Amino acid sequence: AASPSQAYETYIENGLICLKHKIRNIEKKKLKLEDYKDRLKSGENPDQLEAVEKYEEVLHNLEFAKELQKTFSGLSLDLLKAQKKAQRREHMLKLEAEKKKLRTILQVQYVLQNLTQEHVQKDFKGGLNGAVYLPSKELDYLIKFSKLTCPERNESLSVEDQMEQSSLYFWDLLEGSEKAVVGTTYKHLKDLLSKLLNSGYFESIPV
Amino acid sequence: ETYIENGLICLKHKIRNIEKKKLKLEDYKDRLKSGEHLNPDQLEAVEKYEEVLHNLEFAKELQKTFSGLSLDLLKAQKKAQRREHMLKLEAEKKKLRTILQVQYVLQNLTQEHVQKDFKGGLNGAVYLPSKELDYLIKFSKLTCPERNESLSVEDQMEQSSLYFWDLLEGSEKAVVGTTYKHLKDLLSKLLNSGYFESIPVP
Incomplete structure (x- = not known):
């Protein structure tokens, strides 16, 4: 039980919280890598050592992810109002056709009545x-x-x-x-x- | 920006853009190993190679999700269209029968x-x-x-x-x-x- 509008609304909302969850997950490993960094700086396994090398990759991936998040968070209404406008125009066109169908039924009725x-x-x-x-x-x-x-x-x-x-x-x-x-x-x-x-x-x- | 395809946020075009730069950079690197000499701008682009490889894997990961959101949306719209068309069809048949009834009354009045x-x-x-x-x-x-x-x-x-x-x-x-x-x-x-x-x- 949902309309085409609330479906698209749910899609836009699910996209935003998607970036929120992905950014928060990138920032979580950034803090996990920064603690791995301060562990070796103070004086202190091989596998972990492989993660600390991707600190620049993780930091760059965060730059892109936060870029899309700010873009899409504002770009919502540009695609959201375009949906609302396209649905309004759709409903009006259907209303028109319905009214014309009623006129047609009455014309046909008039012919069939006289027949x-x-x-x-x-x-x-x-x-x-x-x-x-x-x-x-x-x-x-x-x-x-x-x-x-x-x-x-x-x-x-x-x-x-x-x-x-x-x-x-x-x-x-x-x-x-x-x-x-x-x-x-x-x-x-x-x-x-x-x-x-x-x-x-x-x-x-x-x- | 061209991230949109039929109203859905699609990174596909950016993925193929990044992939084309990756193939272009891989060519520069192979021409280096063979012995070619490139102008300074091309030498700079070659150092951005690993970053391009990272961006590609990250963009590809995002598309894995945005494609699911796109599929989930399409699935929901199919259901909502079906439901709305059903109801509106029954509402129209009911209105028409009602119209014929009030017409009968008004014609007799x-x-x-x-x-x-x-x-x-x-x-x-x-x-x-x-x-x-x-x-x-x-x-x-x-x-x-x-x-x-x-x-x-x-x-x-x-x-x-x-x-x-x-x-x-x-x-x-x-x-x-x-x-x-x-x-x-x-x-x-x-x-x-x-x-x-x-x-x-x-």
Whole structure:
């Protein structure tokens, strides 16, 4: 249970305490080597003698490590705010798409609602009054699907139950997947409805 | 500085930089043993050889850890993306079903005989004072308007979709003399009333 932000936050924090732990570990052996140095200076094994030679290496490694630590400790917000900004822009783009998806569902609903009507179906069957001709097979997909998305009120179902079933059909249709439905696919139906939406037929429908 | 690769602190470029200087210094040293004569600057760089070897081993040790932090971060982001996508998908399917429900209610509130039931609490209807019912009627004109051929279908649907969105959000922004919050509450009351499970026929 964590968001993409707190993950990156945990990564930045884990990086800083990483340098802290590494610097403290270098400084620990520096003090261990400085005690090995003062032991021989006052007058006092071979293996240890090998460690005291790396005192310059250990001291230089500490110079680099403290350099990165001060750099990254300030460089945090440069990569941390860039993350916050990139997430904000991401969320807004997704919000936009969500709002546009809702508009699209309502447009499609409007087409499917009118396709339940007899005079509208006859127009697409005969290619009449500005409708695009649909072969009887194609028109049947839309009629059948209009009964799944715009059913007449079925009082044996609860409102909530009926709305949920209709909502799933609108959702899958918008997904345009290859799943099967009323003898075709959602993808085919999403294309059919696009043509109908762009045909201009549904801009004004007589009585 | 170029320590960053896709937002992650990566010393890889510095490691290959240090390694290139190590190979360049190893070449200078071999040309020395063979008998070549180098300008003074190159002679100085040759004395920095052991330091370069130490820096390389230290940088390589740091990359061993920063690569793990990078892997741990990527693993966590994969999980968090999956979780967020899951929740947001279920929240969207729920919002849409809710939208279809309130749409059904608001579309039925345009009918006058249904307004009459809520005026006096007739049948299964919640009694609403006429000001409360007015809020809903005016809102029903914004969410379920009669077709306005001055507008395209797309433009009309866009207008309507915003009112549904702001309704479900339930903010305090003003609309038809009340707020989306209060409207959301009224419509929740109407949904829980059961009146719209079986609308009476006049």
